[PDB]
Amino acid sequence: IEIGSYVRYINTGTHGTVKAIEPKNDEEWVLLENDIYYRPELLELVE
Amino acid sequence: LYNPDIGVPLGQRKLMPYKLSNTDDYCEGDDLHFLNNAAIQQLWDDIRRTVIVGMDTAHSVLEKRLGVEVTPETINEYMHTINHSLPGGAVVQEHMVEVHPSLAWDCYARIFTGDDELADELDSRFLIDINKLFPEEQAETLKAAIGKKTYQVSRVPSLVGRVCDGGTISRWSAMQIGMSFITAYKLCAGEAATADFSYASKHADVIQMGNALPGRRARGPNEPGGIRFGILSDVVQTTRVSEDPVEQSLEVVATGAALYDQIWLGAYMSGGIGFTQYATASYTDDILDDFSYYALDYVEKKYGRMGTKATMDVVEDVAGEVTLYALEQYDDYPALLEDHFGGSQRAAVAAAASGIGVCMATGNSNAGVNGWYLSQILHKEYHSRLGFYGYDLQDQCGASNSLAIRNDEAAPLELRGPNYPNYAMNVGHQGEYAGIAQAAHSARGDAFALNPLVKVAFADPMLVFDFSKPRKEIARGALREFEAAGERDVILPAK
Amino acid sequence: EKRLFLKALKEKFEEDPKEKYTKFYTFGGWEQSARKREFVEANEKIVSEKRQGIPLYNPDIGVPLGQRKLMPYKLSNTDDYCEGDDLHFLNNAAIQQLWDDIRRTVIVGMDTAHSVLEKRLGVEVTPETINEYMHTINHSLPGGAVVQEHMVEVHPSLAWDCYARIFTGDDELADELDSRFLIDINKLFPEEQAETLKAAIGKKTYQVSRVPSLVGRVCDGGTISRWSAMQIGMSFITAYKLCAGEAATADFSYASKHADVIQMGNALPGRRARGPNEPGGIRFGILSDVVQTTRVSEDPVEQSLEVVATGAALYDQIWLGAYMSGGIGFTQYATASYTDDILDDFSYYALDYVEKKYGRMGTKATMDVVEDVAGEVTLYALEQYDDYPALLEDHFGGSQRAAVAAAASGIGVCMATGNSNAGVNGWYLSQILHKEYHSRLGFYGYDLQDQCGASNSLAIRNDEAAPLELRGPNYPNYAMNVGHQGEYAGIAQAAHSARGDAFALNPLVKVAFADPMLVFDFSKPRKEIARGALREFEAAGERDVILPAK
Amino acid sequence: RKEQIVDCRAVMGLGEGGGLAQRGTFAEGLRNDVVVVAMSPGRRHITKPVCEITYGIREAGIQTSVLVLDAGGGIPSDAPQGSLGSTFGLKPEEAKQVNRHKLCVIHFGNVKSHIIYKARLFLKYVDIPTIIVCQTPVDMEDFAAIGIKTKNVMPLESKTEGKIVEIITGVIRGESAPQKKIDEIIESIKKHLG
Amino acid sequence: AYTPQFYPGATKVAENRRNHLNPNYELEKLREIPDEDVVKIMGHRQPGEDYKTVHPPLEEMDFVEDYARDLVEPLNGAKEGHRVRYIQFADSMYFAPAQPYDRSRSYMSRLRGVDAGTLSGRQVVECRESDLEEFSKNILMDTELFDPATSGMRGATVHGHSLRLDENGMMFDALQRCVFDEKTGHVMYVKDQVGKPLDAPVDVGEPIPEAKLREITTIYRNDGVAMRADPDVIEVVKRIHRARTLGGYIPTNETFKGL
Ligand code: F43
Ligand code: F43
Ligand SMILES: C[C@@H](OP(=O)(O)O)[C@H](NC(=O)/C=C/CCCCSSCCS(=O)(=O)O)C(=O)O
Ligand SMILES: O=S(=O)(O)CCS
After folding, report:
1. Torsions phi, psi of C103, nearest 5?
2. Strand ranges across the sheet with E186-191
3. Which of B11, C65, C124, D67 is 20 to 30 A from D131 (CA-CA)?
4. Residue among B93, B175, B188 to mutate when testing ligand 2 (max atoms within 8 A of CB)
5. Residue E113 marked ligand-binding
6. Where, by residue number, does coenzyme F430 2 bind (chain C) (predicted)?
């Protein structure tokens, strides 16, 4: 997982490109192209 | 200070339970939907699955063509046979399959006769006794109308009418009647006399609840669009258990609303939500009961139950008085107005009361509908509103069509129905029309309205739906304590 | 000799299938069958409890049942046996759901509605708005009322079988739509079939509405279209918020629920007075398109025989034995066409003969090929009946024999030529050849349409001419008699299975009934009927939540 | 096992044969742990799915209050193109009564677009973790798509101060909730409360 | 010529109905709402921008020669080809100054080229947008036909014509298009007639006092003016009913002798 990758949300399958990683409250968060934070454990890499 | 995120509370009245007229049961409005109420479904099922066959031509064929002698013992044997064959048992043709008896526990073949000597030596298991079920005067009237004739009532299983349509019932009864005839009298399985039996039981001596509607309407027989108002009046059995004319007319109004306005119009000719609050307005609270009792009191105070002959003046007087009283009651009590929030509900209730009053004054059903239409066009001027637009189509042409004699417009209100050209589309009219037709005869204390055979047939105690007190049964169904037939749980897996 | 029906005959009959003699009157009557004993026990309990002593089921009157051995019934291509009583349409929930799923289906095209919304109404239409409309109609179709708590609504558990689905021949729109309520042609059909169906459909969008089964149970079949139209209109005016007038709303209403409506059946005239969506209005091509075995099987005989089974169960059992006659019914005649592999064996022989002689579709439809193929198949079937006495005992009625042999002949002719009317002509030739062979045919009035058929097969007169795909139960010759219509549907399907066609009459019906959300899976009708006969079929329309437990 | 005392509402129910609760009313369970929020006192919400959750929590040993919203039916006025049919809202006193509880359990319906915006308006004024009990399968991300704080899927620009802490699907309005759903709700409350 | 009466009756309600039906009766104006404010509440177009058209101007399009069709002078909105829009009102049963059938009759008696539809709790008139705005400001909103409390310009969700009024005497609204400003005593429209919020609320005046409502209402009520107190209207209604019945039975001069 890194900026510019392609990820999909496992629960719904929304496709987007990772914009930035913005840790908060000692917890990793992933920002996609839809300006929505996600969780790395609920995201996985696709090619 | 204006906060747009406070919201607006809505529907306070609809949260409160709906009482049922002449009962003491409170039910939710969601439980009065015809899909959620098993009692309304069973009402329609019992009406749909009933066919009356006159077993007199068949006896004459057996006597004069086949040389077979018909005696009460032979009729008892035939009844025993048909009670086994009609649900789907096998009588001839070795190697048949049979329907599960658990799915046809509501299937009965009953016999009634106006001949007392023949009714005496008949098995009381299969006999609909007119003497026992009706008071003396009503029993005598029904026997005089029926005559020395024997009739068979076939109630095919409800599952049959639920899988198939309503046109299945007459054919089902005819096939089973023919089979029972050829196996009870030891005849050849197929000859000319068999065709005579089949023709008699298929159309010559058969009585259908509803006529077919071919063409544009496109429906088979025994559908709610084919049931005339007099037939539905004769289905309701309050006339033989109560002497209050208003109560009889109002039970017929409740049954007519629940059948026509709910089932026929909100499902057969519409869909989705349907028209539940349009129909329950006539049988939930005593509003219609109070208006009808006021109409009867006024009529008995100035005219009498049959003290006047139907003229225009009495129609104007009674309909105007009852309409003014009903609208004044709506004005005086905001609870009544918020109960009947829609204009159509109010218009139908006031016009039904006015028509019932005119019928109780004159004993004529066409005068009753004339009073109903006067009430509608007087309501319109009183409140400057009638109902949803599209409601007063028949109410505008009504006055002209009520006493008309032209081919497309003339019919006695007992002979009218949902297939009457004006009445064919709009809700909020038909159940009240049936009630007015019944009130035309409750004024005279008549035993029946249009068909004595239907009255005797639905006086049967083995029907699943109790037609003596339709509102009580509707309330029972709304409270999930009404047992309905047509369910198939013996052939289904455990859930 | 190896025959496909041999194994069933071994299982059904204790003696050799070629043995010409047996013994009778030693089985105890109706006690030999578990179904009859269960019926007797039930009847006793019901009589005593609910009927207050009025008798219901009396085996002691009428014919003494069970003087012979009551045989069990296999189901073709399925390894499960059932009694004949389990295959009665009233005792079988699978057959009831088969009719329910067809009855409660209406297909409405949504392209005129979109065009009217975009141009006349000034409302943009996007895949997001289509998804919103689909959500609205899925909530509102069963019983829902949108953002109106004061409105009466149907209990949700009472209509768990109600769905609203969408499909389209536009690929980009299809992949832009939500997969929750989409019938994907690409992933449901093989590649060539999907391409053919998309080309036939075009770039248009269609919605399928499955009205809840209970609605069709309480009401008739003509209620389905009205229910669908009303809910579609409500959902359209709720999803898209529009500021135009009321007249423009009337134009939109016509465009949305009165323009591209496809019904399963038409209304019937005369003494058959009935509304739409009744089994007597379903054309043979429509029923062939309803069955989805062209999706999962490349065998033409199997594709035709599944349509034969479905058409038998519908036309012969439900339509004819209940809608038109009633009583115990015509289960016998229909089970004869799909119980043992008798028709399977005959049709496989017909296909083999055609492939060896004329090729799979190697000849143009001429009279000579019709005559020789039909004659050969009929002779083979009749000698099969002759030299296997157990087979003749299994198909005891003449009608059930005639229909099976003639169906084999018609399927063979349709294989050879690819023309459905040639196949029906072969059917009629088979019928008269059968009559001359065995000096027998069906019942008293079985061959009304078989003596009139040869002349009406290729006729061009107004009330006599129609392609077999466009014929149905309302065709004047086919109106009354049992044992024909399901086989006619099978022959109509076989006309197209020979060509490897993706559909027979209507692509939209095929795609609509490819839907995985249906209760009855039309990919394997025989398997589902077998499941229903075992009381393992979950049917819809049960009012369990509005009835007392006691 | 400890005594549980409820402050019954001060107003009566809906008529004679109707419901026992009244719209826009609050019944404090003394020790404030969980508040169950019902959209209306009607049969679609009260005693069929809501009092069942109430007695499940009260059986688990956790005191419960039940609040019936004054205007709980409909969609908020801030929904796209406004509301239709009815307007959903939360009163300041209702918000204060909710906010003194450790956790909130709220029962929602079928349509997803309605539930998301109703939850957004609800959490605009509620600052305690809440559990959404709905019928439809809704993913714990569509709320974040419109700005709602969510435990698993946070939004970049949060428009609410409340956290949707759990979503439970399969509870139908007006129908008895099976013991499995009650057990799931109790487990979520226990693990997200103490 | 023929000098028209307009309605039977001697009560104040009958007189008010006659006044609404009379095109020569100048309705008393009770407020002043600017044209742009009316357009904003109507919610169809943005004020200041040109009207959208449905067809070219009548001069551009070519029509066949039609002597009878050309006898009628078209509306200006028709001449320019403007689209047809609507304005809808809900009237309270508690002494609202105008009522549905009264509204429809007055509209079809006073305005040209209008489409009026009547429901129990609704009344809508459709016309070309420019003329619709003109007579909505001049007649529908500024005059006594409109009371901001008991009547409300509202499409979409209409409900409350039969419910009781709220604490300020305002008709019930499920969307709350108009709210009562207690500081100034005026009614302000915070949403347009379909329900989308307005950027700036528009002042539509203050509620008419209840005595004036009693004096100018067109509804019959047991508490204010009963139909029994107006026997002349009942007699005319009964005459219409009897004439309809006799004409539908046998339409001859002999059967109408029993009129
Ligand atoms: C909400 C609508 C939208 C529309 O197209 N029709 C509605 C709604 C529709 C839906 C409700 C379900 C839904 O999801 O919309 C259905 C069931 C249509 C049908 N299939 O018969 C219905 N109305 Ni309506 N509708 C009713 C009624 C009414 C009364 C309400 C009066 C009031 O002022 O509150 C008025 C008609 C009138 O003005 O006279 C009315 C209007 C309206 N009715 C207008 C009003 C808003 C509009 O301008 O768009 N209904 C009633 O008067 C009671 C019976 C009730 C019907 C259902 C029942 O019988 O249970 C229902 C009958
Ligand atoms: C009384 C009739 C006249 C008529 O209109 N129908 C009958 C009887 C009827 C009844 C059987 C009633 C019962 O179970 O006792 C029903 C079910 C029709 C109904 N809905 O009532 C029926 N036949 Ni018939 N009927 C059948 C058949 C047949 C075949 C029987 C062949 C033979 O062995 O002789 C013959 C026709 C023939 O002339 O060849 C036949 C005749 C006859 N069939 C002859 C004379 C029967 C007799 O044995 O006395 N059925 C069959 O061929 C199998 C299918 C079977 C149908 C039920 C099912 O599918 O299970 C049944 C269909
Ligand atoms: C079958 C259909 O015929 P038609 O629509 O072609 O006239 C016919 N329906 C109607 O006439 C009209 C249907 C509307 C339902 C009744 C309205 S109740 S609520 C709507 C109030 S309004 O705003 O429409 O005035 C019927 O018999 O149900
Ligand atoms: O044998 S008949 O032709 O009468 C009917 C067969 S079921």
Report:
1. -65, -40
2. E178-181, E186-191, E197-203
3. B11
4. B93
5. no
6. 146, 230, 326, 331-333
The CA distance from A14 to A16, in Å, is 7
Q: Which residues, in sequence order, are bridge partners of residue C206?
A: C109, C167
Return the DSSP state at E182.
T
Amino acid at B440: A
C23 burial (CB, 10 Å; 0-12 / 13-18 / 19+) is exposed
Does C326 appear as a known binding residue?
yes
In E, residues 186-245, which contact D (CB 8 Å cutoff)?
Answer: 191, 195-197
Give the containing element (helix H, strand E) for B344.
helix B343-362
Closest residue to D110, CB basis, from C139, C148, C157? C139
How far apart CA B138 and CA B393 sit, in angstroms, is 39
Partners of residue D37 on adjacent β-strands: D67, D106
CA C340 – CA C81 distance, rounded (Å): 10
Is the separation of the CB atoms in E127 and E85 below 8 Å?
Answer: yes
Q: Are E8 and E21 in contact (CB under 8 A)?
A: no
Show the 3-state SS of D30-46.
CCCCEEEEECCCCCCCC
Task: Give the number of the ligand closest to the Cα of residue E100.
Answer: 1
Dist. CA D193–CA D185, nearest whole Å: 12
User: What amino acid positions of C are annotated as catalytic residues?
Assistant: 148, 333, 445, 481
> Which of B213, B270, B392, when mutated, tests ligand 3's pocket best, judged by the most ligand atoms within 8 Å of its CB?
B270
CA dihedral C495, C500, C502, C505 (to 10 degrees): -20
Annotation marks residue B237 as catalytic = no
Question: Both tokens of residue C543?
Answer: 């009012």
Pairing of strands D25-27, D64-68: antiparallel
8-state DSSP, C546: G
Looking at chain D, which residue has its C-alpha nearest residue C155? Answer: D174
Q: Which residues of D touch B16 (CB under 8 A)?
A: 14-15, 18
CB-based contact C215:B44 (threshold 8 Å): no
Please name every residue paired with A21 in a beta bridge, in sequence order, or none if there are none: A30
Q: Whole-angstrom Cα distance, residue C372 to residue B466? A: 65
Give backbone dihedrals phi and psi of B459, rounded to 5 degrees, phi first. Answer: -75, 0
Task: Note whether C533 and C314 are within 8 A (CB).
Answer: no
Distance separating alpha carbons of residues B22 and B247, to the nearest angstrom:
8
Residue C76, CA atoms < 13 Å, CB-side half-sphere: 29
- Rounded to whole angstroms, the Cα distance separating C351 from C356 reads 9
C105 contacts: CB under 8 Å, gap ≥ 6 = C208, C209, C210, C211, C224, C264, C277, C512, C513
Residues 13-32, chain A, touching D (beta carbon < 8 A)? 14, 29, 31
Rounded to whole angstroms, how far apart are CA atoms B328 and B325? 5
Q: What angle separates helix C420-438 from helix C398-417, to the nearest 10 degrees?
A: 140
- CA atoms of B265 and C274, how far apart (whole Å): 18
Taking the CA of residue C443 as reference, the ligand 4 atom at the shortest distance is 3
Question: Which ligand is closest in space to the CA of residue C68?
Answer: 2
From the CA of C442, which ligand is nearest? Answer: 2
> In angstroms, rounded to a whole number, what is the distance separating the alpha carbons of residues B418 and B383?
28
Q: How far is CA E127 from CA E78, E81, E88, E116, E133, in A?
A: 9, 12, 12, 9, 9
Strands B150-155 and D34-38: unpaired
| DSSP three-state, residue C154 | coil
Q: Whose CA is nearest to atom 7 of ligand 3?
A: B425
Please indicate the experimental technique that yielded this structure: cryo-EM
Q: Is any atom of ligand 3 closer than 6 Å to the C-beta of B389?
A: yes
Is residue C471 marked as binding?
no
> For residue E135, how far is the Cα from the chain centroid?
10
Which of E41, E55, E83 would you mutate first to test chain C, the one with the most C CBs within 10 A?
A: E83
Angle, in degrees to the nearest 10, between helices D50-60 and D179-193: 60
Residues with Cβ within 8 Å of E16's Cβ and at least 6 positions away in sequence, in order, are: E97, E216, E217, E218
